[PDB]
Amino acid sequence: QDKIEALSSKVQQLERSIGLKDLAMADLEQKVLEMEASTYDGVFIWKISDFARKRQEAVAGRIPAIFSPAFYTSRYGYKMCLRIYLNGDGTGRGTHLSLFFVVMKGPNDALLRWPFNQKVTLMLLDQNNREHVIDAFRPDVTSSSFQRPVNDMNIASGCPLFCPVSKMEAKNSYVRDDAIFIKAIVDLTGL
């Protein structure tokens, strides 16, 4: 009589358990991926695969921007990531690939000097190594993008007109095997 319920119940426990498990498993795999991509010398190379598909999701307005994994200035320095708009943003919407720099809340922010005042260099690599698209900027000590993070990420700041779209929607050497590579180099002077 009850024995039948005596099973449907546990079997309901197991599924609940096996279920609550996979979530943790999820967070663990994400942690591992983040660790796999991080660097601690202020130099970062971001490989964006499935460029065509992500390029379309950008035009079709489905997915306007993508964040990159996080990296650091030193083993215990600032935490940072990149944000890109495959089809542009602001003064670059529809015409240029827009690339921004993001300051994230780091584990050691209490030991670092604020505001963030380092020169940042951004590049779109020529997979032919002939002519890389490059641009750099110095932080505007007065912007809120470089103040000590109160949230997980400050307002991004960088180059809205980083690179012209036509420069890749045609026959180029920046897109190959349906993937592009972005490079970031944070000048470490003073650290």
Binding site: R83, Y85, D89, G90, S98, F100, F101, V120, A136, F137, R138, P139, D140, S143, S145, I155, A156, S157, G158, C159, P160
Partner: peptide
Amino acid sequence: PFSKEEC
């Protein structure tokens, strides 16, 4: 140069 926030 100088940086510009995203809009």
